[PDB]
Design a protein around this ligand. Structure first.
Ligand SMILES: CCCCCCCCCCCC(=O)OC[C@H](COP(=O)(O)OCC[N+](C)(C)C)OC(=O)CCCCCCCCCCC
Ligand SMILES: CCCCCCCCCCCC(=O)OC[C@H](COP(=O)(O)OCC[N+](C)(C)C)OC(=O)CCCCCCCCCCC
Ligand SMILES: CCCCCCCCCCCC(=O)OC[C@H](COP(=O)(O)OCC[N+](C)(C)C)OC(=O)CCCCCCCCCCC
Ligand SMILES: CCCCCCCCCC(=O)OC[C@H](COP(=O)(O)OCC[N+](C)(C)C)OC(=O)CCCCCCCCC
Ligand SMILES: CCCCCCCCCC(=O)OC[C@H](COP(=O)(O)OCC[N+](C)(C)C)OC(=O)CCCCCCCCC
Ligand SMILES: CCCCCC(=O)OC[C@H](COP(=O)(O)OCC[N+](C)(C)C)OC(=O)CCCCC
Ligand SMILES: CCCCCC(=O)OC[C@H](COP(=O)(O)OCC[N+](C)(C)C)OC(=O)CCCCC
Ligand SMILES: CCCCCCCCCC
Ligand SMILES: CCCCCCCCCC
Ligand SMILES: CCCCCCCCCC
Ligand SMILES: [Cu+2]
Ligand SMILES: [Cu+2]
Ligand SMILES: [Cu+2]
Ligand SMILES: [Cu+2]
Lengths: 236, 382, 382
């Protein structure tokens, strides 16, 4: 069996959900979403923010708790074939993390180079912010934490210790979410110019750099793949 | 749509827009709508806002639903940033061409280099038609007419696709062979020196030479075509001509100003001294995009936005005609739902509880006087 | 010699020099030459240049071939930086004393704190004699006359040579023994503790004590001699007195201005309104150190530099006398080889294609009027 169709679902769920989110923000961007003090803004974007925050907290708790509770206690008695299957599942988790990272840190982030550059902000909760920071960021954080936990709890290579590159790849992009405080503080106070390259953005950048730890993470996963079932063929 | 969130005192004391007019309220695609009016730069410019040494006359709108055909300060076109003087009154004119159908809230705004957006009154303008009918023709000094909607789009797409294809070809050339794990094992276990061998080096040399040669040839071709080019035209424009307004014949001294918390009314006591030779009457109080009118004295006919217009929102304790030379003190109340809708009541949250505004005084013959008032605004709770 | 490289529009709209005069064209060593004139700070000061809050009246020249004896703005000496006001006209006077023989291109220039050099017209001045004959005497408040060419030179040489000799003595004392490789081997192989032993420590203590004592004694001696000293005198000088020019009786409105690319001519259409009570005629157009003259109206007699002077470079379509109260529109062409020699045609490369200049209008009796014009400058290619 090895690599199964969980990868198709991993791609499709993010693609479909974010396409629907884009449709929603295209429909309610203007017209209930321009005026932050209008009653329709509360029903179409503040309610969205509340619901998405609650659902993200619940989903993160459930997913992480399930992954930690179903952790493999007897990692020693794991056959190489099962280890290969678990390595493929972890690679599917990493693919989902990469897809979510794309959607969060490229699409919905630059989608702002398109929302603010065009409108005069009305709040710290621009409908797009209700999409980027409170969805395009918690979703990829949840996916990254889940992938890290799966590696630690199913892969003997990633067990017996916390991998530094994986921890950086998982936590650095997470630090972008609390960095939103610097974004807000340095939008209203420091810098009223909509300059996208303002120093009030070296906060997603610095922690965007930590995603480069995917390189060490991926060579670690390559070594984990090539533990018992490394071949032969490769180097033979 | 971006105001009602800015600080009330900052909206009150930055820039006062008046004599605003709109040529049309409903337009077709490609039809032109003109916005005219005057703005006065308040003398008590807040220290937190940089002085309007570099300012841009902008339009508040949800993306290019209109295109700014022309914009004027004084009588001269202002496509760049301009320098404004504190205390001066300027007249402006913005010409917009409809591009996208719908109902749009169009604001005239002034962006200041170190203070952010100063949004004036916004008016709903209806656009009907199809976006596909929109044209933005322009004639260059080289004698060709192009449509700015799609000019150079094909060339941009072609060049970007070409370079993307070159990069993808490079990556795929290296990706035909196995990529990650066997190459990693070969590099780790002993010297590799086997995964990069001729003609891989020849292919890379070809890629590098072709890239440089194609860049040079494309630049030369884009220089032979379009032989006449100019850099981007930028730079703040000085010498904006302000309006030479006559000195007002009305002097007003604000003796305290209060507003109820909570409430929708603002109360102030004014000592009005009438100079000149005509009986005056208080007709309007404009504070921040909100016009409180005394309907018995003046009526608005310029189609001011209804949510910003208080037809009878201005009540004067004694608004009888003020004979020349006579001085009297009256209690003026400006009350309207707009005071709470546009969050002018939220000056209680502000770190500077001072207001500014314009009082419009009208005589019998109809000629009007504009006087500016500013004072601390004291909340009242009991 | 540093202009013709600066941006054409920046040379056009910073500072307009006019009424320039030179006392002499050829001088001897120690002889004085005086440069006089007026400069007007343009109202449309470019935003890329900091406002002339801190400005210095300098001389453009290849090193001290002259010494600046005196310099005045208004009527007062300006050895320090000064504050200038935008839109004001100031008169200046620079006194130069010849120091080095040769043919020198002397410019009057204004350095602005945040904008760099603004170079005015330059004139060739011949210096004859020998540099050895040059003297720069000055009398101090302590009652001694010194020559600034060689004053303190001996003392400076002596002290520098003394301290250099002390350092060389230290180095040579340590350099008598073998230096690099045996000492390195001794330090590496085992503890060294042998290459620095008494009386080396005694010699170093002597060097340190002698250095401190000599510094203290020299400072005390240089305080006993020259007991009266003052710090360097610095600081921007405010309150420069501008010229109180009468309000011009001529108003000019520029209706478009064009220049051919390539070409040596600039064309503009002006609407001239003559107020006052005398028939006026356009005699000069000054744009950037270049004077285009209508020879039928005015002739230059102040010895203006020939390469900057267009004697008949100004052609007016109808330069008949303009009766008072009369308004007419004429086509004015300023054409000369200077327009290309000084790269005023390179405004096509500039990111701000706007020009500024001065128009000089002369009546029958000879009294002149100065009016300032500024407008966009549109290139024409076909
Ligand atoms: C990592 C964990 C992430 C957790 C957060 C998830 C956020 C989900 C959206 C919040 C909506 C909100 O809050 O708003 C509630 C909205 C407000 O729209 P309405 O006014 O009712 O109009 C009618 C509804 N339309 C405008 C959508 C037609 O209505 C709803 O009930 C519909 C929400 C549907 C969400 C599920 C579909 C997603 C695409 C399919 C692939 C998954
Ligand atoms: C241990 C080390 C930690 C130190 C960090 C503490 C935060 C500093 C707070 C500054 C307050 C101050 O000092 O003054 C506040 C000054 C006062 O200026 P103003 O006159 O109001 O200007 C008016 C201009 N407005 C209207 C736009 C404000 O506003 C500033 O210029 C803010 C400068 C930015 C400093 C924050 C940079 C954070 C770096 C983030 C990159 C990851
Ligand atoms: C070894 C490398 C050294 C780095 C050099 C840093 C000094 C540059 C700052 C100059 C400030 C300035 O002048 O600002 C320039 C304009 C501000 O425009 P304005 O508002 O018109 O400024 C008017 C008032 N000024 C000009 C006096 C300030 O944009 C900026 O804010 C600077 C953007 C910097 C982008 C480049 C940094 C890339 C980030 C990489 C790390 C994540
Ligand atoms: C609406 C939310 C639905 C999320 C569904 C989560 C599925 C449960 C997670 C999980 O444990 O594994 C699911 C799949 C297949 O891996 P499994 O083998 O089921 O995982 C355990 C491994 N073990 C069987 C050897 C013990 O592993 C995967 O690759 C699933 C990837 C799912 C993409 C991540 C979605 C997260 C959105 C916030
Ligand atoms: C918010 C920012 C995160 C800060 C980063 C700190 C975490 C980084 C290191 C890390 O993840 O290790 C914690 C464990 C991995 O196993 P260990 O750290 O070895 O310890 C396991 C026992 N423990 C679950 C109680 C911790 O991983 C887990 O066990 C996590 C799953 C259990 C948590 C589920 C409950 C959370 C619901 C919200
Ligand atoms: C790899 C990222 C793909 C992002 C594509 C996207 O944002 O799609 C939205 C956009 C919306 O434009 P349109 O297709 O005209 O449909 C408009 C519907 N709304 C306004 C809700 C987006 O176009 C599509 O839906 C095309 C489907 C692409 C599938 C990968
Ligand atoms: C890594 C490079 C960081 C350079 C910082 C920078 O460009 O700041 C520009 C800004 C100059 O402000 P300015 O660009 O004039 O802002 C104009 C808009 N307002 C006045 C509203 C802020 O300077 C500061 O306020 C100090 C920045 C500290 C960085 C750790
Ligand atoms: C207004 C001048 C701002 C200068 C900022 C310097 C940033 C340097 C970062 C090391
Ligand atoms: C090393 C490659 C240098 C290429 C220079 C090309 C110059 C062409 C002038 C138009
Ligand atoms: C440790 C050496 C300090 C020297 C001080 C000398 C003071 C002299 C006063 C004129
Ligand atoms: Cu609006
Ligand atoms: Cu005002
Ligand atoms: Cu020279
Ligand atoms: Cu001038």
């Amino acid at each position: 069996l090895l690599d199964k169709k969980w990868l198709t679902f991993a791609l499709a769920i993010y693609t479909v959900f974010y396409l629907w989110v884009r449709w929603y923000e295209g429909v309610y961007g203007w017209s209930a979403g321009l005026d932050s003090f209008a009653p329709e803004f509360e029903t179409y974007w503040m309610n969205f923010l509340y619901t998405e925050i609650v659902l993200e907290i619940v989903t993160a708790s459930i997913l992480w708790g399930y992954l930690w509770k179903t952790r493999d206690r007897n990692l020693a008695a794991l056959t190489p074939r099962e280890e290969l299957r678990r390595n493929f599942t972890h690679l599917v988790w990493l693919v989902a993390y990469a897809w979510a990272i794309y959607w969060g840190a490229s699409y919905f982030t630059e989608q702002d180079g398109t929302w603010h550059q065009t409108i005069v902000r009305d709040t710290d909760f621009t409908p797009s912010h209700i999409i980027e920071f409170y969805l395009s960021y918690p979703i990829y954080i949840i996916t990254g934490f889940a992938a890290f936990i799966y590696a630690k709890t199913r892969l003997p290579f990633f067990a017996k210790g916390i991998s530094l590159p994986y921890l950086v790849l998982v936590v650095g992009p997470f630090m972008i979410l609390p960095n939103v405080g610097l974004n807000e503080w340095g939008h209203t106070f420091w810098f009223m110019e909509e300059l996208f390259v303002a120093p009030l953005h070296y906060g997603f950048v610095i922690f965007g750099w930590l995603a480069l730890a995917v390189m060490g993470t991926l060579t670690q996963t390559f070594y984990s793949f090539a533990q018992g079932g490394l071949g032969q063929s490769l180097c033979e | 749509h971006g105001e009602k969130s800015q600080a009330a005192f900052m909206r009150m004391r930055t820039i006062h827009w008046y004599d605003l007019s709109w040529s049309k309220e409903k337009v077709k695609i490609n039809e032109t709508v003109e916005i005219k009016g005057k703005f006065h730069v308040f003398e008590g410019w807040p220290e937190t806002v940089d002085e309007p040494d570099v300012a841009f006359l902008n339009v508040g709108m949800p993306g290019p639903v209109f295109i700014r055909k022309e914009s004027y300060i004084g009588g001269q076109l202002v496509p760049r940033s301009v320098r404004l003087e504190i205390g001066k009154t300027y007249d402006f004119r913005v010409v917009l061409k409809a591009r996208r159908p719908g109902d749009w809230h169009v604001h005239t705004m002034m962006n200041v280099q170190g203070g952010g957006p100063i949004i004036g009154p916004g008016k709903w303008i209806t656009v009907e038609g199809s976006m596909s009918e929109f044209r933005n023709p322009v004639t260059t000094l080289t004698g060709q007419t192009v449509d700015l909607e799609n000019y150079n789009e094909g060339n941009t797409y072609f060049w970007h696709a070409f370079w993307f294809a070159i990069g993808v070809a490079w990556i795929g050339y290296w990706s035909r062979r196995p990529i990650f794990i066997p190459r990693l094992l070969m590099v780790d276990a002993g010297r590799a020196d086997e995964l990069v061998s001729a003609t891989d080096r020849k292919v890379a040399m070809g890629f590098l030479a072709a890239t440089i040669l194609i860049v040079v040839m494309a630049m030369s071709s884009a220089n032979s075509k379009y032989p006449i080019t100019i850099p981007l035209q930028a730079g703040t424009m000085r010498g904006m001509k302000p309006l030479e307004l006559p000195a007002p014949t009305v002097s007003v001294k604000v003796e305290d100003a209060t507003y109820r918390v909570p409430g929708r009314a603002m109360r102030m006591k004014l000592t009005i001294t009438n100079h000149g030779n005509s009986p005056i009457r208080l007709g309007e109080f404009y504070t921040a995009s909100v016009r409180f009118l005394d309907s018995d004295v003046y009526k608005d006919t310029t189609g001011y936005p209804e949510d910003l217009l208080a037809e009878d929102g201005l009540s004067v304790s004694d608004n009888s005609p003020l004979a020349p030379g006579e001085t009297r003190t009256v209690d003026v109340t400006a009350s309207d739902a707009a005071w709470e809708v546009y969050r002018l009541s939220d000056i209680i949250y502000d770190p500077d509880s001072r207001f500014a505004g314009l009082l419009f005084f009208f005589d019998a013959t109809g000629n009007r006087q504009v006087v500016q008032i500013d004072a601390p605004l004291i909340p009242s709770f009991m």
